[PDB]
């Protein structure tokens, strides 16, 4: 149950070794058809991610931006989910104000980051309506999602095992397994998971 993680390329990790999770969360580097100072996954690479094996019943949290607000809906459907909510993170500055200036979108300026919420199967043991669908938190970077989301997800689905994709070191959390290519090595604690890992990668 303590924080666990796997430094890996998510396109190639045999994700069936991880078992089933009540919540999946992903913050992928979408191809937004723009020049970016970081690498992205192609649309086909995103479509091909083996999200379906990670869960049979539960929730998906998929951060989206740009053209991915439609591609993310497509992926939710390719992976077998239906969209039932959409959280926005409203970005504030040091004085709890909206940053209104600059040119931060193509047509209008951008004050928020969106996260699609999908459901799969027949989840049980969840609590509806505990949190709002608006998060207010100061920006460090838009990639750096707010830690508030972990408490919302724990209040939604307490005590269940959860998996995060494209996480960074700071994202590791109790009850979560974190996958990403900038994590420090491999640190599993669940005996069944490492048993299946050792069998698949000895």
């Amino acid at each position: 149950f303590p924080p666990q993680w796997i430094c890996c390329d998510i396109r190639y990790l045999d994700v069936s070794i991880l078992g089933k999770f009540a919540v999946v969360m992903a913050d992928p580097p979408w191809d937004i058809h723009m020049e970016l100072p970081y690498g992205t996954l192609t649309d086909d690479e995103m479509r091909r991610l083996n999200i379906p094996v990670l869960q049979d019943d539960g929730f998906l949290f998929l951060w989206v931006t740009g053209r991915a607000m439609e591609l993310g809906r497509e992926c939710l459907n390719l992976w077998g989910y239906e969209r039932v909510d959409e959280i926005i993170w409203v970005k504030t500055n040091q004085l709890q104000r909206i940053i209104r200036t600059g040119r931060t979108g193509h047509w209008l300026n951008h004050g928020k980051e969106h996260c699609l919420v999908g459901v799969k199967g027949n989840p049980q043991g969840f609590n509806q309506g505990l949190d709002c669908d608006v998060i207010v938190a100061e920006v460090r970077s838009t990639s750096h999602k707010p830690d508030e989301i972990y408490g919302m997800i724990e209040r939604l689905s307490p005590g269940t095992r959860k998996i995060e994709l494209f996480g960074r070191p700071h994202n590791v959390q109790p009850n979560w397994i974190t996958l990403g290519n900038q994590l420090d090595g491999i640190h599993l604690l669940d005996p069944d998971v490492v048993a299946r890992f050792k069998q698949r990668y000895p």
């Binding site: 039932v84 959409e86 004085l95 459901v119 509806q128 949190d131 998060i135 508030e148």
Partner: protein, 285 residues
């Protein structure tokens, strides 16, 4: 400070703690930002048509009777979810199939924008399908975030699929035709406003959308031909043609309306040298 935890504890929504959201006193501490908005609003006011409106049963109406073509269309079909989620409607509610059947492409100008109020549930997905059907590309999402400073805290939750409390509505923005920000500054002023509107949740039975949506649209597109479909008596506004089933009077004349935009007039507002020197622009390549 975890404002999500704080909502769980107190019922005060996180958006209650965003500072300086009011429209009127927005840039009070930044005179050049305030001047940009002031000058653009003056430009809009100088060039606005007098209000025009038409009572029409939009589901039976031949929409092609609305002429000339429109540079911006604001669409606010009465969704059942507006009344059910907060209470009984005094007009026909529209399903997303009803909305999709509208022939918006027949009245949109070849280069133009649409602003579609979609609610907070299935409309976020089905409104995107409507955009496709009408020939627009979804290009922004303006969220109306509602504070509950007056009556904390946790309210309605009616959608068997929802898992969070829904405290916002989405107005999807769509683009039709080819518009290039670098060359089409006589049609759009991009980046003057942000894609958020923050106001207190309206009173019970008040289904109006915030008037700031008009300011965002008018600042962004210099086209003067502006249609508000499903507007009401209370939304009538200079610079707009308002068409809807609950209007109690009609003054629209298509020929008179068109005459405001034809020679010697233009369908575009134009711009002043002062606004050109204040508005956000790209740097030299």
């Amino acid at each position: 400070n975890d404002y999500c935890q704080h909502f769980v504890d107190t019922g005060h929504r996180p958006q209650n703690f965003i500072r300086d959201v009011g429209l009127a006193d927005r840039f009070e501490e930044y005179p050049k930002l305030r001047e940009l908005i002031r000058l653009k609003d003056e430009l809009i006011a100088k060039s606005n048509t007098p209000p025009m409106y038409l009572q029409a049963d939009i589901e039976a109406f031949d929409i092609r009777e609305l002429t000339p073509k429109f540079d911006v269309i604001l669409l606010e079909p009465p969704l059942e979810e507006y009344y059910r989620e907060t209470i009984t409607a005094n007009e026909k509610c529209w399903t997303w199939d009803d909305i999709m059947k509208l022939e918006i492409d027949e009245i949109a100008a070849p280069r133009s924008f649409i602003f579609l109020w979609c609610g907070s549930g299935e409309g976020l997905d089905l409104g995107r399908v409507c955009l496709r059907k009408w020939g627009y590309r979804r290009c922004e999402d303006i969220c109306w975030i509602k504070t509950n400073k007056n009556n904390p805290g946790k309210t309605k939750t009616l959608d068997p699929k929802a898992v969070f409390q829904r405290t916002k509505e989405h107005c999807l923005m769509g683009i039709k035709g080819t518009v290039k920000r670098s060359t089409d500054g006589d049609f759009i002023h991009a980046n003057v406003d942000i894609d958020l509107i923050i106001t207190e949740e309206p009173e019970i039975g008040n289904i109006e959308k915030p008037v700031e949506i008009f300011h965002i649209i008018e600042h962004f597109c210099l086209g003067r031909r502006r249609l508000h479909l499903f507007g009401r008596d209370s939304t009538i506004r200079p610079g707009w043609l308002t068409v809807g089933p609950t209007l109690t009077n009609s003054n629209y004349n298509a020929e008179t309306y068109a005459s405001y935009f034809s020679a010697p007039n233009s369908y575009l507002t134009g711009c002043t040298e002062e606004i050109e020197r204040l508005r956000p622009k790209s740097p030299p390549p």
